[PDB]
Write the C-alpha cells for this entry.
Amino acid sequence: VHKHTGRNCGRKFKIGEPLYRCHECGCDDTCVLCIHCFNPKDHVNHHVCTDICTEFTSGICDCGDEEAWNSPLHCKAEE
Ligand SMILES: [Zn+2]
Ligand SMILES: [Zn+2]
Ligand SMILES: [Zn+2]
C-alpha cells in the first residue's frame, strides 16, 4: 500500500510519472504530490498543475511533510 500514516510519503518519481502541484497549497513551486497521494477533494477550484516527470525534474512526493504545505492535506491512499 501507498499509505504512510504519521510520516512523509517520500515516494521517488520515475520518468514518465504524473506529478501534482498546487499554487495555493504548495509552499513553493518545488512542493509536489504523487498520484497515490493527490486527493482532488483537497483542491476544488484550486490552481492544480499536473505535469509528466522527465529526466531533469527528478524528486520525491511531499505528502505528509507539513512544511511543504499551507493547508492540511488528506492523503488519497489513506481513504
Ligand atoms: Zn506520495
Ligand atoms: Zn500521501
Ligand atoms: Zn490545493
